[PDB]
Paper text:
Cytidine deaminases (CDAs) catalyze the hydrolytic deamination of cytidine and 2′-deoxycytidine to uridine and 2′-deoxyuridine. Here, we report that prokaryotic homo-tetrameric CDAs catalyze the nucleophilic substitution at the fourth position of N4-acyl-cytidines, N4-alkyl-cytidines, and N4-alkyloxycarbonyl-cytidines, and S4-alkylthio-uridines and O4-alkyl-uridines, converting them to uridine and corresponding amide, amine, carbamate, thiol, or alcohol as leaving groups. The second one is formed by the homotetrameric enzymes (T-CDA) such as CDAs from Homo sapiens and Bacillus subtilis. We propose that CDAs that are active toward a wide range of substrates participate in salvage and/or catabolism of variously modified pyrimidine nucleosides.
CDA_F14 was chosen as the crystallization object because of its wide substrate specificity. Asymmetric unit contained eight CDA_F14 subunits forming tetramers. Each subunit of the CDA_F14 tetramer consisted of a core of five β strands (β1 to β5) sandwiched by five α helices (α1 to α5) and exhibited a fold characteristic of the CDA family. Three subunits were involved in the formation of the active center. In the crystal structure, the active site was occupied by two molecules of 2-methyl-2,4-pentanediol, which was used as a crystallization agent. N4-benzoyl-2′-deoxycytidine was docked into the determined structure of CDA_F14, and the following interacting residues of amino acids were found: Glu55, Asn42, Glu44, Gly54, Cys88, Tyr24, Ala46(D), and Tyr48(D). The hydrophobic substrate binding pocket area of CDA_F14 (distance to the docked substrate shorter than 3.9 Å) was formed by Val26, Ile77, Thr79, Gly85, Ala86, Pro87, Leu107, Phe126(B), and Leu131(B). The β3α3 loop (amino acids 79 to 88) of CDA_F14, connecting the third β strand to the fourth α helix, was identified as most likely to influence the space for binding of N4-substituted nucleosides. The CDA_F14 had Gly81 and Gly85 at the corresponding positions; consequently, the binding pocket of CDA_F14 was larger than that in CDA_Mmu.
Numbering used by the authors:
A (entry chain B), B (entry chain D), C (entry chain C), D (entry chain A): 1 to 134
């Protein structure tokens, strides 16, 4: 699957968002090396702190089906915002552990597209081995 | 799909848990009325507060693919613990919004099985309409 | 300090809430046996999942200053809602860990007042011992 | 208060951490322009996702007592780790909203000290304006 088709999957996921409170929709799609895709959308809650982000929905779905970082080809995350948005800090913390440093993260607001890797988005990362080796 | 087969799916999901820090594995499976299943497993992070529970993984996956409360037939959540466990308070807050009150939640530790609905697990719920009608 | 004066502290805390997105204000006050009080208010974030609840703000402040469950006398949580609200499921999971079973939790919307304990609000608790004994 | 004395307060807070699961202790101290300090420490939960970080404990306490970003002089965050640690991505998302761009964040492991600002720690921030303008 090419970048444009993966972004199309993420825009399809964006229509599945559950965002009664903000009305702000985020779509994501995690593409596995074997070609399997996992959609993700943001899912809000009346208790706002229980809200989940769309890119977390997608990666948690992939891991729950037995995929691991080494099995993931790419992640796309999209909005219809005025500028291209990046994953929030919570999602960066998750992706810092669950993605390898070469996995592209494609970001698009439907007008422009950017490509990042997780190390660019989160300096001075606190890692699994920082904790396990403590 | 019967209860025993749904529990078997959740036990499968339990083997996909990512829990390097606690070693405690939770599996879940959300069954849609159309027969589709969504696995969920707990996914930990070196920053413990970014951990996601397995039943959240499963329900977020279902919603991210366009299913809503009315489309969900049942949810199973399993462990290998010494007693049958219920969803934690975070997950109860999520399920209080994302499940209807008649949807069975099957709980099993592999030795005993219980059936609950969300209202039993969370008294005095704070709901979408409590917030939107404020 | 009596119940009415503790509720008054929680109403003071409610005026400190940071809720630019929902405009829904929650106040809390944790009272220590030595007479010390800790205010808490809800504090929202543009990434909704990073929002903190007021009763968590209060209890985390108490613990961060060295207090523990046996050092705490009571917790008050208040709103201006149409009915008396209880802590959300996230907060119940926290209070299940950080309060003793019978420590009073006073709830008020300014029109009615209720008294609860954590056991009444959270059946089938997942506890420290369930995890440590696994 | 000077930088060394603020770090000393954060090290005092670190001794108040509640980390029964990881045994990893973090302390923080938020210093207000009026001289008031707020300690924060990490506070774990048997449901790991309900864990709170120390720097969030501190900043939520400040806001719950009425302080806002313009009042915050500095934040210190400390550990005893092998290398100097930065706030995790969750905490960066919170600090992006609750601190001004140039408020100093002092980091120390007791052997080395660094000074950062939130802009250095979190590129491509998703802000209140991005949401409110949507
Ligand atoms: Zn996010
Ligand atoms: Zn849970
Ligand atoms: Zn809450
Ligand atoms: Zn943190």
């Amino acid at each position: 699957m090419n970048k444009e088709d993966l972004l199309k999957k993420a825009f399809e996921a964006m229509e599945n968002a559950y965002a009664p409170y903000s009305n702000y929709h985020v779509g994501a799609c995690a593409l596995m090396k074997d070609g399997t895709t996992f959609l993700g959308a943001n899912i809000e809650n009346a208790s706002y702190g229980a809200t989940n982000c769309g890119e977390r929905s997608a990666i948690f779905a992939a891991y729950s089906n037995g995929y691991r970082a080494d099995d993931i080809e790419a992640l796309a995350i999209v909005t219809d915002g005025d500028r291209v948005g990046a994953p929030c800090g919570i999602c960066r913390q998750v992706l810092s552990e669950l993605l390898n440093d070469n996995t592209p993260i494609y970001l698009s607001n439907g007008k422009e597209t950017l490509e990042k890797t997780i190390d660019e988005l989160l300096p001075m990362r606190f890692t699994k081995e920082d904790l396990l080796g403590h």
